[PDB]
Amino acid sequence: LNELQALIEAHFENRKKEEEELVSLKDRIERRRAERAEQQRIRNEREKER
């Protein structure tokens, strides 16, 4: 059953690599969007200060 071996590894290797990468890639996108939220907070504070 070469297929069980192909599947046992394909399931794990293709997914752990692609999936964990999406977790951290998006974590950075999300952190940047969170920075945008901070920058909007900053923008709101600056408009009020002016």
């Binding site: 059953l1 297929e3 069980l4 071996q5 599947l7 046992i8 399931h11």
Partner: peptide, 29 residues
């Protein structure tokens, strides 16, 4: 865990065959 649903079947066959023989070997007297 299909890899082991399949490994299970292979080992199940290996033991079932060994078992078939255990049973026959005793049955043969």
């Amino acid at each position: 865990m299909d890899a082991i649903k399949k490994k299970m079947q292979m080992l199940k066959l290996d033991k079932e065959n060994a078992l078939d023989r255990a049973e026959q070997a005793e049955a043969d007297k």
